[PDB]
């Protein structure tokens, strides 16, 4: 595998195509989904020269601890879908790459089994039908060694997939939601979080300036600027257009991380030089695992750091905060 | 049907040839039929989140009366074209949906008749060759129960459609200008018709910033910001691209409604967070009542009240009026 | 036909493969002969509403007479290539149609046999090896009755025309210059023509303001704003592109026409919106003398006529001023 | 041969596949090598009218040296693997064209064979694992007549070429780098090789303003506002689009190169028009030496020299100075 673009090729070769439209689809007539894509063709970076790469490094310090990368695996729910190993193999690559790796609250292993492969597991948390219940997933996942809260902000209710619809998709009975034997979130949820836990709690699925302004004066940790892959309102505008605004109105009070279309070393510098302070990988890290299971993974890992070191470089830049400094220009 | 595309590939089956093209045609080279799509698909929401929803409504008030949606069925002339029950089925099913259908001037069914069914009947207007019958009209829809005159304002004659001239397209016998046994209006036809009626008068077809503040003035209770589907002028700016400005200039000062290739419910929450107070739906009806007649309206219709709700929600608007105050950014 | 594209299919028919890409061509890459059309179609019209059209009216005065339409027949070199009565037939049709016509200084049937068909003749005229001559043939052309001295003045020599450089196209024996038994020109070649002539000078191919100025302040009585169909500088901006800086600029101080891809009545509209006091029309008046002789041309001007006044009175516009009145807005 | 494009068709017919993939190919998914083509096809020129071109001259100087065009045969390395007089055939051509010609580091032939052909040689250098051995080649090359060194600054390593890695590409044995028996640049290599050299220095690959501004002050005599024809950083802007930024940022303080998809006069026109003192163009040189050895490349120069002087004149310039003064704007 020599891009991104290889593995997805792969994985429609084996999976059955109602999980792979379950995995590749989005919301309406999948209008953000695509433009998550043209957004990021749209950026052109402009590399620097002539400036000293003896030591480049790709390493950033996120949450308390040092990641190899400038990105972390998306929650994506449901990983035994794409491979029998499912989230497990997925965190055993992500933990040899030093990648952090965002468990689900329908994860289909238990959050403990993923948490106990080790390496830098976050949480990702869907508000329940009742604070109590909600807070013990969050207790679950701090007593478990998880070191962030990803609470998704952006799913009061799922949105219209019309391919699930289509092809009346509905869980194999073999996959289930390992953490059990939902209602819409509000601030209010946040604050609730937020006062249960020492960890970062990062809004995951914030478009609005506003809300990312609010996010901070609410004690987030962090935020992703994302729409959810398109998957959840068909016309909602990519994360990457709105992250440059984002991050001034933030003025470095949370992390801001993007996500939506990453699918190379140079979208990562492309992201970065927007601002982020990191990407998440949704899709084609199930397409790594769909098509060769945890060695998949970390195919597609190592090639993803091999194409930002690459970027860097190329673009003069010796590490993460110079590449941050960047500049772009939008071309057509 | 999960979309309103569904509808389209449906009519286009049943359809004899020549009257699906005079109801999907435009005129000359169809340049602003395609515009009010292109240009509709170039706006993106800029979703809130973390609102309450427990109570989301569609609901609107608008001429007096209480809709269920910002939505009403635009005039389509001559709808035994597309169904034997023609506009009886159409009014049926949206006084059963709540949404207020626009009686046309030239029904192939009688006004009265239609106004019957109940519902929250709208009457467009035609300015016919004399004052004196024209008023007749008007008079008669109030009478009737209409609620509110739709003066069409942008056809002093009907455009040049080059595929009925092609088709040599004709009313099939059967189908008849049931109201019967015209003149380019002036702003001295809407006084005319002011003065002859309490009924809100709705300008249809206003695209220039200083004819939607004439007509504030002239005491129109509303406007639709039209190109008329792109069967009028070819070459005419969509009303999607002048619905912001207009709604700037008219300061509150009337309901300000859009029209032209809205065709999901995710189109409704980007005209409402342009600014429109709602919007007319034309093809998209047509389609359903030839597919499946009132049935397929009352589908349709519920369709398009389950994406609303849908874009609404996911978007953070637990009103209309919330929905108004989105912002938008443009696309490619 | 119904539309002016109906004739270029007539005319591909019928004519030799290397006529027709003589007559269709453009130099280069012919990206300035596709950006005429390209810059036209992202032009839209915001119609008026409302206005009294009970006389509407497509004449206007220029260079002292009347005309029909904005409209005159550009000049195109020997057009007995297209047909066997060449210019005969085409300054007919315009003579009955009330177009000005305007005679080549390459046309295959001498000028004085042109003008004696009557009507509105131009003189278009390329600048000759010497000044003596060149004023000569204008001399004869106000002998015989010419209006205007159409001063070409974008070709100090003729473009790569690729086409006719891979079809090794030639000059059928058969088609000569009639009215023969060239030179850059510069400022001083126009002050010469302005000198021995009274009627209009009118300088053909300019698309800097700056030389619109100083066109102005040369005494010319107008220009046209173009590239030459594309044919000469290959990337050469079109002349709408420029038009509306071209006419601020110029301050009312001459006529300023515009050619290049004019093919509707809409398209007419469009350049007059922009400013311009005329349009010429090139290749479709070919395509119907190629397609039907002189009653192809009739039928082109007729139809041309009709989409003129059908654009104007849809965009409330009962005279040419009100038309140069209208705004415009960019679209996709 | 009529244009720049004969060439390439030709070339594809005679080259092997991998070799034609490792000449046409970009980095990663070829943006930037697609986006330099887009860029120049979106810059369109106003031309000036009626100037006098008694005199036109094609002619600059550059260097210290007079050029018989604004244009240089860009570095490409072992054009041995395109026809067997590689680089020998390349220079004569460009000689007999009075075009300086840039010998490679890695060469395929040795530096003081191709620099005894004659003509304009420039030396391009890439900075070597220590300093002594780069200067030893930059001491060669000013021993063997060149007159400017082109330093490489664009080329930390080598760009991720994946039709290379797809292809299995390797250098024939039969190809050799002729100049020998690598590490990144930065600005101190640059400062070495300024004081080792009397020769102008120009940086090849500079593509931030603030890049521009220290080569000026470094010392440079030139730069090239260059992405390295899209084969290095993937997402890099194009050089034509920062080339007009840059150029007002050096005010004159050294030569500003452009290249990048320079296919036609005109291009070499767009170029000078942006600002720029002259063009490299890099893979139509090989095409022709693919297609015909040294008369390819005479042929490709002759064509190259005809279309910048027609198009020089039809946009009113009878020197390259005069179209530096051209303004351009952008279409679509
Ligand atoms: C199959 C699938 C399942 C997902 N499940 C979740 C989820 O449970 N929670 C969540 O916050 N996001 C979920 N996401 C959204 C991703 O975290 C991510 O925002 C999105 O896929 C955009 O990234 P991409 O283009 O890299 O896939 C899911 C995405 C996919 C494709
Ligand atoms: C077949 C057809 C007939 C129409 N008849 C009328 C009419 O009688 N009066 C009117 O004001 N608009 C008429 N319209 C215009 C519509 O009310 C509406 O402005 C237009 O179709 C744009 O909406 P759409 O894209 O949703 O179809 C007609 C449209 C169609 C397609
Ligand atoms: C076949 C042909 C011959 C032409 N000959 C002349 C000419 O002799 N003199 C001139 O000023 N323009 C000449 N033109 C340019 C036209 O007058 C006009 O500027 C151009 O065709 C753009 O208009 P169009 O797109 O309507 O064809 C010629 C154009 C064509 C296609
Ligand atoms: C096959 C090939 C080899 C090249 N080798 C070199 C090189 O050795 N040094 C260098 O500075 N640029 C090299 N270049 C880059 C060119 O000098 C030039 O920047 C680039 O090809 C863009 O120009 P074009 O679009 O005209 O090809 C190479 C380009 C190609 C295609
Ligand atoms: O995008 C997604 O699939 C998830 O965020 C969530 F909405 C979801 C989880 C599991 C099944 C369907 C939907
Ligand atoms: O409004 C802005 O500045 C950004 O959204 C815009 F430039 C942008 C478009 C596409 C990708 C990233 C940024
Ligand atoms: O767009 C339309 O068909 C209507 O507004 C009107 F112009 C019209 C009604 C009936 C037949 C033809 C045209
Ligand atoms: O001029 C403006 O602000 C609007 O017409 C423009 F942004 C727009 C383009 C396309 C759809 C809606 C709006
Ligand atoms: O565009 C054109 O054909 C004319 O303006 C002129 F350049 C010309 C006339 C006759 C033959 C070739 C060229
Ligand atoms: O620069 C400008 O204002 C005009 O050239 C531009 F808007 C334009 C683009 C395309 C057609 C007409 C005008
Ligand atoms: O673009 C290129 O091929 C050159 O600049 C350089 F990177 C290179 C030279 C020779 C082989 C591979 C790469
Ligand atoms: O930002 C700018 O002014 C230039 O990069 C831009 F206009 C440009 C786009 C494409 C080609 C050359 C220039």
């Given at each position: 595998?020599?891009?991104?673009?290889?593995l997805?090729?792969?994985?429609?070769?084996?999976?059955?195509?109602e999980?792979?439209?379950?995995?590749?689809?989005?919301?309406?007539?999948?209008?953000?989904?695509?433009?998550?894509?043209?957004?990021?063709?749209?950026?052109?970076?402009?590399?620097?020269?002539?400036?000293?790469?003896?030591?480049?490094?790709?390493?950033?310090?996120?949450?308390?601890?040092?990641?190899?990368?400038?990105?972390?695996?998306?929650?994506?729910?449901?990983?035994?879908?794409?491979?029998?190993?499912?989230?497990?193999?997925?965190?055993?690559?992500?933990?040899?790459?030093?990648?952090?790796?965002?468990?689900?609250?329908?994860?289909?292993?238990?959050?403990?089994?993923?948490?106990?492969?080790?390496?830098?597991?976050?949480?990702?948390?869907?508000?329940?039908?009742?604070?109590?219940?909600?807070?013990?997933?969050?207790?679950?996942?701090?007593?478990?060694?998880?070191?962030?809260?990803?609470?998704?902000?952006?799913?009061?209710?799922?949105?219209?997939?019309?391919?699930?619809?289509?092809?009346?998709?509905?869980?194999?009975?073999?996959?289930?939601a390992?953490?059990?034997?939902?209602?819409?979130?509000?601030?209010?949820?946040?604050?609730?979080?937020?006062?249960?836990?020492?960890?970062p709690?990062?809004?995951k699925?914030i478009?609005?300036?506003?809300?990312?302004?609010?996010?901070?004066?609410?004690?987030?940790?962090?935020?992703?600027?994302?729409?959810?892959?398109?998957?959840?309102?068909?016309?909602?505008?990519?994360?990457?257009?709105?992250?440059?605004?984002?991050?001034?109105?933030?003025?470095?009070?949370?992390?801001?991380?993007?996500?939506?279309?990453?699918?190379?070393?140079?979208?990562?510098?492309?992201?970065?030089?927007?601002?982020?302070?990191?990407?998440?990988?949704?899709?084609p890290?199930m397409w790594?695992?769909?098509?060769?299971?945890?060695?998949?993974?970390?195919?597609?890992?190592?090639?993803?750091?091999?194409?930002?070191?690459?970027?860097?470089?190329?673009?003069?830049?010796?590490?993460?905060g110079?590449?941050?400094?960047?500049?772009?220009?939008?071309?057509?």
């Amino acid at each position: 595998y020599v891009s991104l673009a290889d593995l997805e090729r792969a994985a429609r070769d084996v999976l059955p195509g109602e999980i792979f439209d379950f995995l590749a689809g989005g919301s309406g007539t999948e209008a953000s989904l695509v433009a998550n894509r043209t957004a990021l063709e749209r950026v052109f970076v402009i590399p620097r020269m002539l400036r000293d790469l003896t030591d480049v490094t790709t390493e950033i310090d996120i949450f308390g601890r040092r990641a190899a990368l400038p990105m972390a695996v998306a929650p994506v729910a449901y990983q035994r879908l794409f491979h029998p190993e499912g989230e497990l193999a997925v965190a055993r690559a992500a933990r040899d790459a030093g990648v952090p790796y965002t468990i689900c609250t329908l994860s289909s292993v238990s959050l403990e089994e993923i948490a106990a492969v080790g390496g830098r597991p976050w949480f990702q948390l869907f508000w329940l039908r009742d604070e109590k219940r909600s807070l013990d997933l969050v207790r679950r996942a701090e007593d478990a060694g998880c070191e962030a809260i990803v609470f998704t902000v952006d799913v009061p209710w799922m949105g219209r997939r019309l391919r699930d619809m289509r092809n009346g998709f509905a869980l194999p009975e073999w996959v289930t939601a390992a953490n059990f034997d939902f209602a819409p979130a509000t601030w209010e949820s946040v604050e609730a979080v937020r006062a249960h836990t020492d960890l970062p709690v990062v809004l995951k699925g914030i478009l609005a300036v506003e809300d990312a302004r609010r996010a901070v004066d609410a004690g987030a940790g962090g935020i992703v600027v994302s729409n959810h892959g398109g998957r959840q309102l068909d016309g909602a505008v990519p994360g990457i257009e709105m992250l440059g605004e984002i991050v001034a109105a933030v003025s470095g009070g949370c992390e801001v991380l993007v996500d939506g279309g990453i699918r190379s070393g140079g979208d990562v510098l492309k992201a970065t030089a927007l601002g982020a302070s990191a990407v998440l990988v949704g899709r084609p890290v199930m397409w790594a695992l769909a098509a060769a299971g945890q060695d998949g993974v970390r195919q597609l890992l190592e090639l993803l750091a091999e194409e930002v070191r690459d970027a860097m470089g190329l673009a003069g830049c010796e590490s993460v905060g110079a590449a941050r400094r960047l500049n772009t220009k939008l071309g057509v």
